[PDB]
Amino acid sequence: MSTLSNFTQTLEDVFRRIFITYMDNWRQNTTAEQEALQAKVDAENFYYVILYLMVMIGMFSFIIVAILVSTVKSKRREHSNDPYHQYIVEDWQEKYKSQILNLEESKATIHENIGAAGFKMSP
Numbered sequence: 001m002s003t004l005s006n007f008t009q010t011l012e013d014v015f016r017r018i019f020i021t022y023m024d025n026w027r028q029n030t031t032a033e034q035e036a037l038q039a040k041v042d043a044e045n046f047y048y049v050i051l052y053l054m055v056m057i058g059m060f061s062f063i064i065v066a067i068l069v070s071t072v073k074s075k076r077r078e079h080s081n082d083p084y085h086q087y088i089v090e091d092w093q094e095k096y097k098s099q100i101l102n103l104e105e106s107k108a109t110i111h112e113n114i115g116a117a118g119f120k121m122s123p
Contacts, residue, residue, distance in 0.1 A: 042048050085091075
């Protein structure tokens with residue numbers, strides 16, 4: 001019995017609220033960053049209109065190209081079979097070692113927190 005699978009279903013519901021809420025809270029603290037930036041606004045002003053055009057046509061062109069390539073490649077309709085880096089198993093054993101190394105680093109990072117107050121009760 002892996003309660004981890006049953007609990008995962010619940011985590012998604014909370015993460016959903018925390019994510020939507022997390023993204024929401026950020027918008028509140030983000031203001032502070034804007035308040036300081038708004039103080040610098042734009043003395044040129046002319047750039048505000050110039051930059052607006054850059055994203056104007058740039059966005060419209062991106063869409064046209066997006067479908068052009070999608071519609072163009074769509075005519076490709078390819079369905080074959082090609083071998084993928086089969087050595088993915090050998091290269092993995094190399095990165096697999098990094099995990100063990102990271103674990104050691106965590107101990108040093110975890111102990112740091114306890115430094116703030118690592119003194120249970122005296123005997």
